[PDB]
């Protein structure tokens, strides 16, 4: 797949065994689907927000 989509696949994989927080479920879904964008600064932000390993998303 394209590199833009692998990043979205990584996010979906992080939450596969999880429930999404009611307050975050709309933004999370937008990121997974692509209706919101997903830059480098954002990727580090999300990784810190949920405690993902550094660089988990790319």
């Amino acid at each position, epitope marked *: 797949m394209q590199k833009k989509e692998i990043r979205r696949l990584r996010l979906k994989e992080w939450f596969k*065994d*999880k*429930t*999404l*927080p*009611p*307050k*975050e479920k709309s933004y999370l879904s937008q990121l997974m689907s692509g209706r919101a964008s997903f830059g480098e600064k954002a990727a580090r932000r999300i990784e*810190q*927000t*949920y*405690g*993902m*390993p*550094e660089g*988990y998303l790319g």
Partner: nanobody
Amino acid sequence: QVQLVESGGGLVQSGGSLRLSCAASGSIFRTTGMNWYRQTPEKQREWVALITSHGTTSYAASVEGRFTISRDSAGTTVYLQMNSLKPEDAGVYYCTTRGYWGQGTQVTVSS
């Protein structure tokens, strides 16, 4: 680089309550989310709950409404409050953040 310490486990009667704590090096929980997992006699590593650096939370269906995840006032410690415990909540509970994992703490429910 990051160390994590779970505590608060022990023996508890069915229907009782308990509060687990997770300590994390470098005051990291002030600015970073985390997850709790548990390992029960049948099946392994089952996600339990999460709290983000924002303070927002989610729970597994099997504990939602009975477990509550929060930070202490300092923001350095995360609590997994449990109430209305059942024998099927027994297991080893692990805290995790940034890919690092605690040693775990055992919850035994009598009954």
